[PDB]
Design a protein around this nucleic acid. Structure first.
Ligand SMILES: [Mg+2]
Ligand SMILES: [Zn+2]
Ligand SMILES: [Zn+2]
Lengths: 388, 49, 97, 140, 49, 147, 133, 263, 63, 113, 66
RNA sequence: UCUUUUAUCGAGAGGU
């Protein structure tokens, strides 16, 4: 087996027709296969110890059928939903966002390298944006070096005027990013993005080179920029914590009111529901509002360099419930839609009285993973995880 | 080890019951077919004679 | 109105009811009352609701094919073994299942 | 000694500091309960130490609460596959297979219970200098 | 033995990431390469190689 | 020790590793994108507490359900002459230059499993067959074939 | 030589979101109804509230593969202190005496609003901005 | 044009401030000192007899990591450019060790000082292992209980720190530049303040602190560098530095030779 | 056999493996396969590079 | 089982030139140099020095894959000067600097002891 | 099992600081001061010696089969 | 001038 043979490449268990694709061979030392990371989306694969399989052709007819039917560039667009599958993942995405900002300037000896990395570059170093006092390029230029020539794209996000104060929206004219931060909504897997446009224009192979170009540029820059997470990324101030702890206190106090009404027969019965179902529904609405209200508070305090806001703001990994469950309240625990039932007779744990129905008596966790967990709350959390 | 089987799915003999406080471990358990079946006693447990 | 229990052939004939728009979801009765075409449309609507409840989005010709294979002989032909095995295909194609 | 069918009838306090209800306000230490509907208790027992509810392969984890339970499960399943030293007579026995580690090192984050699992006279694992960086891109 | 038989010229191994390849390439070790093979026809355009 | 499994990707030598300001290089770099979606804070707390435990000179206590906070380790480490949240100024090993970002840094206790690539790689050209159906056989220690 | 030329007075400077980049709003002196909105780098040409700027717009400097400028040649740049290179991405001819020129300087932005006969020659494809004092 | 100002100088470590040069020349000097200073180390082991409680390659590993004295190692040739067979005298240094326990009570400790130089090319200063004092025993190789003979013979060859991390001379090399942060090459994380939340690098007094009324210059370059070199005794720091510069010069001369003869 | 030096112990006198022990695993012609003792690998080596053990010391390929 | 022998990171076989040069064609007076068995040390030490002479307009390098051992370099001056001569000049200058540094270090050492 | 020779991260030889460490632990010193007296400032060389598990003590008490 | 052997049934412990 030598360089540039087309081999079939497969992972079990294969589902949709994208899990069997023919790659080109490249001989390398050591004992493991190699993949470009952009093909981790149809395989449902990750490098945490998986295995895959390689099949080899033999005669010429089947090699022709592999190279002309089962290739990778001819599979970028999925017939399942009329939208692509392979996009930008992980560091390349986070740092392409960090690269295409409005306050990012590069000096010359670095631009020379960043331009010499691009395999499809021509040989015309573009003029800077600040000819004087000091030549300084930006990031949208050295990104626009990667995009081919003739592409047009126009996207409005939130209804912004063509002055762009929050740097949202997107305008690509002739392959030069005029304005717009490039993140997931553009170079991802969504319909109407960049990959779908170039795919439906300049051909499949050009779109098969775009990935390499962009990933090389962004990986070089981010290599010379660095990125890291710390424990201080998950620690809020003392101002918001008192606000959060108070919002829960009123929510908890509110609970005390609903229980009172239910015990003095002064509660409105909801249609189609017994008294106790309506009661349980009410409590849950109050507590879930509290968690969201508290979680929304912690999320908005955070400054403009809390790494987690960059990894979530880039849309690459995570979302709001993570910040909420690390900085505010862990919240509710569920078992089959209803809550921690009474295994013991008329009480949850033997550490509580009978007919006790305060928040923490039936699962409502009250802390955050930075502070800690009381034993009962830990037990209930383990129960929920076991359900999952 | 509890011999209830592997068929019939069901999520009642596999969950963690409330009366398992301190008599068995909550976290440690295998995965796959026998989740919740195989148990590992706590650190201060004992069997009568 | 959204009512429990199915009984279409009676609720269609009630004054005040728009008898043309009344719709159910037990498409067996829809077959026993409105024919095969309304049953096709209803079945498609059901699958579209089921898949569409959780954000996922399929493109249409696939679901239209699936619902136009179940109802293309005169009655509902479910996908298990009784509905399939009774066809006139080759013996090997049916024994390999 | 109490068992399971009796545990229904009793009433337990979690910590000794709870047997005499106090006379605070901190963001670091967690929020303990209140017993909202009980202006006077009559506790009848007391848990020795609440960390005894764990198993054997779960007492290896430091701070087994600042996590998420599927991770305590995954770790509780992988802690039984690590190399190390299984006995001190590996020279004279003749089993089928055996793995040994050159230079074992006892951990720097000890839970008290480790003292009884012989887990610092026959350790299984090494300390290491760890950094967290999106570097050249090979660590994804 | 008919729907899904066993095949030859197969390879099973572990994966690893590498950001310095192009989209449709793969990295075959040296051993798997010297074990697998390929039949080629001798013509007039390749007899030297 | 926190359910965070992973394999080796590439191996760098000493002078290429991002050496810190003092000369200490890290041995194992893991990836920030593995934390915020998995939420394992006890890994970070473990790293910090182990840093202080090594700086002052004793095995640090870490029993669940106690009183040990994070602000305490913060005050201790801040007193012993470092940045409280364990961040460091670090250089690039290639061109000796301050990275625009500080890196969380410290010793953690890692353990090594029993899954080796030298016990999983396999391939076949034309080995033996069976007798009943004359197909490839099932196995790895027998030059078997894949399904 | 120069296509446009005027003197402005910086009225409001917005920082807020970023550190290096500030956004200045300016109205002229010899005539109103000519508004300029610009983004600039602070740590190169720092500005302040209530100042004065000498602004010039020119399609070329001389009196393709870029290369470092020699210390022995000159242009229209040796008379100024802040020169940027930009592209035009929208030219509006709205109702009445109103023209809005949208010039993107390699990522930073500038909106120029003025009358017809004053700006009707700025219908190029690449613009140099030059700022003095 | 370059300058040197030694701050601390002694036997086996140096602390100096290297000034008025470029960046990649000092960095390339560091990498050269960590990667290419050809030293000497044990390479082959032929165990005649082992009856202890340690597997062989464990011992051969520990012997594989032992620092030897190598002042005159820039004259001996490599292992690949000697035309003999097996080995001779202008290509290796031969060591031998022999230890045994004698009695019923006791636990003899086989150290590294018990290595006896047998034959080597002379008269050069190699072979002998590094000793700290005039009494110190050194590295602890093995231990022997009742009736457990150990007798081995080792070969020692020359190498560099690219073929194995054992021929390396220096341990860790401290390096920094610009303490007060004036070039703005980095940014500091903070919760409240970026000044009352950071240590002060030991050298923040050698340069002056910036004025809070200063503007931002934009033509300066990293100029004054601070570095510190340690050793393990196999060499002495001045020899490490000089040999590093010498090796770099020889490399550049080699490339220039290729460019010239390629005409 | 098909040669008189198979399975006989060998020392290597040239190359990157100089001074290492081995055994002739296969000596088809000119290019031999010596099974090194030191790491678990069998290497290709020319027969000119080998010393064979005989009655008196290590002899070259004149045994 | 499949490991590259370490010494192959700095020992050159016979059928491999230490240095190979090929002229690029898309622009005039620009050449591509190919270095074997070298890393960031030589490449950077040359790059930062060539990136200063007021007659070289574009110089850069890259290492293609860190598992192998080589790097490639792009050099473009102006019309008057031929790049090869400039490269040689840079080598000579750097050697001179190193010599001076060694001298002054030895003096300061013999004074400091 | 037994004290290493080099370190693991930097390579500063710590194979001759076990006897002095034990002997300084007989005199009632503290680990922090017993390492501040052995000259170990970077905490990698410190963790190399602070967390060692000496096992050969056991491996000897099994009578020799040879 | 090649060639060159790995039972069988069943049970369990595991990895994605
Ligand atoms: Mg996986
Ligand atoms: Zn010799
Ligand atoms: Zn160290």
């Amino acid at each position: 087996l030598m360089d540039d043979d087309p081999v079939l490449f497969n992972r079990q268990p294969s589902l949709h027709k994208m899990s069997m694709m023919a790659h080109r061979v490249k001989v390398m030392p050591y004992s493991t296969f190699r993949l470009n990371l952009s093909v981790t989306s149809p395989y449902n694969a990750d490098f945490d110890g998986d295995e895959m399989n390689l099949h080899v052709p033999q005669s010429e007819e089947t090699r022709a059928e592999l190279s002309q039917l089962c290739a990778v560039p001819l599979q970028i667009v999925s017939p399942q939903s009329n939208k692509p599958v392979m996009g930008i993942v992980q560091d390349t995405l986070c740092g392409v966002r960090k690269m295409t900002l409005r306050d990012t300037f590069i000096e010359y000896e670095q631009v020379m390298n960043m331009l010499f990395w691009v395999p499809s570059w021509d040989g015309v170093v573009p003029q800077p944006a600040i000819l004087k006092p000091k030549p300084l390029w930006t990031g949208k230029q050295l990104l626009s070096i990667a995009i081919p020539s003739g592409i047009h794209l126009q996207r409005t996000d939130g209804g912004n005027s063509l002055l762009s104060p929050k740097d949202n929206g997107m305008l690509i004219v002739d392959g030069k990013v005029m304005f717009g931060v490039v993140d997931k909504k553009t170079v991802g897997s969504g319909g109407g993005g960049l990959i779908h446009t170039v795919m439906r224009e300049k051909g499949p192979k050009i779109c098969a080179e775009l990935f390499g170009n962009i990933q090389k540029v962004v990986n070089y820059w981010l290599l010379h920029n660095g990125f890291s997470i710390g424990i201080g990324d998950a620690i809020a101030d003392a101002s918001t914590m008192k606000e959060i702890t108070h919002a829960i206190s009123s929510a908890k106090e509110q609970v005390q009111e609903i229980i009172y009404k239910a015990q003095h027969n002064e509660l409105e019965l909801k249609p189609g529901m017994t008294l106790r179902e309506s009661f349980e529904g009410e409590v849950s609405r109050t507590l879930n509002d509290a968690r969201d209200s508290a979680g929304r508070s912690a999320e908005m305090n955070l400054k403009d360099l809390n790494n987690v806001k960059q990894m979530v703001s880039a849309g690459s990994k995570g979302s709001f419930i993570n910040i909420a469950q690390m900085s505010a309240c862990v919240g509710q625990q569920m078992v089959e839609g209803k809550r921690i039932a009474f295994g013991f007779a008329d009480r949850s744990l033997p550490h509580f009285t009978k007919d006790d129905f305060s928040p923490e008596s039936k699962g409502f966790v009250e802390n955050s993973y930075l502070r800690g967990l009381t034993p009962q709350e830990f037990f209930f959390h383990a129960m929920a995880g076991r359900e999952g | 080890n509890t011999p209830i089987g592997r068929d019939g799915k069901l999520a009642k003999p596999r969950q963690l019951h409330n009366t398992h406080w301190g008599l068995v471990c909550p976290a440690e358990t295998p995965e796959g077919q026998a989740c919740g079946l195989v148990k590992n006693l706590s650190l201060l447990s004992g069997i009568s004679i | 109105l959204e009512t429990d229990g199915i009984n279409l052939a009676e609720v269609m004939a009630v004054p005040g009811v728009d008898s043309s728009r009344t719709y159910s979801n037990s498409f067996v009765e829809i077959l026993s009352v409105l024919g095969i075409e309304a049953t096709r449309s209803s079945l498609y609507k059901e699958i579209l609701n089921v898949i569409a409840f959780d954000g996922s989005y399929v493109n249409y010709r696939h679901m239209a094919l699936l619902v136009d294979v179940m109802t293309s002989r005169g009655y509902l032909m479910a996908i298990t073994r009784h509905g399939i095995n009774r066809a006139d295909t080759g013996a090997l194609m049916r024994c390999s299942f | 000694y109490v068992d399971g069918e009796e545990e229904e009838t009793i009433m337990i306090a979690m910590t000794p500091e709870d047997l005499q209800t106090r006379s605070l306000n901190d963001t670091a230490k967690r929020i303990k309960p209140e017993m909202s509907t009980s202006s006077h208790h009559t506790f009848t027992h007391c848990e020795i130490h609440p960390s005894m509810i764990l198993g054997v392969a779960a007492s290896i984890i430091p701070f087994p609460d600042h996590n998420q339970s599927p991770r305590n499960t995954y770790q509780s399943a992988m802690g039984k596959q690590a190399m190390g030293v299984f006995l001190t007579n590996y020279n004279v026995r003749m089993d089928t297979m055996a793995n040994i580690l050159y230079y074992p090192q006892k951990p720097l984050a000890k839970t008290q219970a480790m003292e009884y699992l012989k887990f610092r006279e026959l350790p299984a694992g090494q300390n290491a200098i760890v950094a967290i960086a999106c570097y050249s891109g090979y660590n994804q | 033995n008919l729907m899904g038989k066993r095949v030859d010229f197969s390879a099973r191994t572990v994966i690893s990431g590498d950001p310095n390849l192009e989209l449709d390439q793969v990295g075959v070790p040296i051993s798997i390469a010297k074990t697998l093979s390929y039949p080629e026809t001798v013509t007039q355009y390749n007899i030297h190689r | 020790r926190h359910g965070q499994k992973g394999t080796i990707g590439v191996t760098y030598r000493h002078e290429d590793m991002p050496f810190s300001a003092e000369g200490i290089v890290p041995d194992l770099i893991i990836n920030p994108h593995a934390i915020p979606s998995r939420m394992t804070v006890a890994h970070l707390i473990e790293c910090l507490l182990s840093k202080v435990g090594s700086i002052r000179g004793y095995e640090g206590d870490a029993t669940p359900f106690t009183d040990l906070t994070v602000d305490a380790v913060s005050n201790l480490l801040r007193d012993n002459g470092y940045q409280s949240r364990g961040f460091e100024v670090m250089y690039n090993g290639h061109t000796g230059k301050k990275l625009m970002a500080q890196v969380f840094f410290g010793p953690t206790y890692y353990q090594r499993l029993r899954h080796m690539v030298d016990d999983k790689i396999h391939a076949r050209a034309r080995g033996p067959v069976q007798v009943l159906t004359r197909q490839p056989v099932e196995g790895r220690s027998r030059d078997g074939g894949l399904r | 030589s120069a296509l446009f030329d005027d003197i402005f007075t910086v009225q409001t400077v917005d920082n807020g979101r970023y550190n290096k980049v500030s956004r200045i709003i300016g109205i002229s002196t010899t005539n109103s109804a000519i508004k300029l909105t610009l983004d600039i780098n602070n740590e190169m040409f720092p500005v302040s509230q209530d100042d004065s700027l000498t602004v010039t717009l020119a399609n070329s400097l001389s009196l393709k593969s870029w290369r470092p400028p020699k210390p022995t040649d000159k242009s229209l740049a040796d008379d100024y202190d802040y020169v940027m290179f930009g592209t035009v991405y929208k030219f509006e001819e709205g109702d009445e005496d109103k023209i809005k020129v949208y010039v993107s300087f390699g990522g930073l932005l500038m909106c120029l609003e003025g009358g017809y006969k004053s700006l009707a020659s700025l219908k190029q494809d690449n613009l140099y901005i030059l700022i003095r004092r | 044009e370059p300058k040197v100002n030694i701050i601390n100088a002694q036997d086996d470590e140096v602390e100096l401030m290297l000034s008025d040069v470029n960046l990649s020349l000092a960095n390339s000097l560091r990498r050269t000192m960590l990667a290419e200073v050809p030293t000497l180390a044990i390479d082959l082991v032929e165990i005649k007899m082992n009856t202890s409680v340690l597997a062989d390659e464990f011992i051969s590993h520990r012997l594989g990591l032992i620092p030897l004295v190598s002042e005159d190692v820039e004259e001996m040739k490599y292992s690949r450019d000697c035309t003999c067979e097996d080995y001779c005298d202008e290509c290796s240094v031969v060591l031998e060790l022999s230890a045994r326990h004698e009695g019923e009570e006791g636990t003899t400790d086989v150290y590294s000082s018990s290595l006896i130089k047998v034959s080597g090319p002379g008269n050069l200063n190699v072979g002998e292992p590094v000793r700290r004092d005039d009494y110190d025993q050194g590295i602890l190789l093995c231990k022997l209980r009742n009736h457990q003979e150990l007798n081995i013979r080792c070969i020692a060859k020359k190498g560099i720190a690219k073929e194995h991390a054992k021929w390396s001379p220096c341990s860790a090399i401290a390096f920094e530049y610009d303490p007060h942060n004036k070039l703005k090459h980095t940014d500091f994380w903070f919760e409240v303040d970026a000044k009352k939340e950071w240590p002060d690098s030991k050298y923040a007094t050698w340069e002056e602190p910036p004025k809070p009324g200063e503007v931002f210059d934009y033509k300066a370059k990293p100029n004054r560098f601070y570095m510190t070199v340690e050793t393990t005794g196999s060499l002495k720091a001045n020899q490490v530095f000089s040999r590093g510069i010498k090796t770099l010069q020889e490399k550049l001369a080699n490339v220039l030779f290729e460019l010239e003869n390629s005409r | 056999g098909r040669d008189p030096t198979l399975n006989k112990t060998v020392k290597i006198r040239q190359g990157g493996y100089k001074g290492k022990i081995g055994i002739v695993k296969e000596a088809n012609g000119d290019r031999f396969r010596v099974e090194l003792h030191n790491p678990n690998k069998t290497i290709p080596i020319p027969c000119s590079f080998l010393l064979i053990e005989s009655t008196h010391g290590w002899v070259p390929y004149e045994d | 089982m499949n490991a590259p022998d370490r010494f192959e990171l700095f020992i050159l076989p016979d059928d491999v030139p230490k240095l190979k040069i090929t002229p690029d064609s898309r622009v005039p007076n620009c050449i591509i140099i190919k270095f074997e068995r070298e890393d960031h040390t030589l490449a950077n030490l040359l790059r930062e020095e060539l990136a200063l002479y007021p007659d070289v307009t574009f110089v850069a390098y890259k290492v293609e894959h860190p598992l192998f051992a080589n790097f490639v370099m792009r050099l473009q001056t102006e019309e008057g000067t031929r790049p090869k001569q400039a490269l040689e000049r840079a080598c000579a200058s750097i050697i001179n600097k190193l010599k001076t540094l060694d001298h002054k270090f030895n003096e300061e050492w013999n004074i400091k002891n | 099992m037994i004290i290493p020779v080099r370190c693991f991260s930097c390579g500063k030889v710590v194979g001759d600081k076990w006897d002095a460490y034990l002997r300084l632990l007989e005199e009632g010193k503290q680990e922090g001061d017993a390492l501040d007296e052995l000259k170990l400032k970077r905490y990698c060389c410190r963790r190399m010696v602070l967390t060692h598990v000496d096992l050969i003590e056991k491996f000897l008490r099994y009578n020799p089969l040879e």
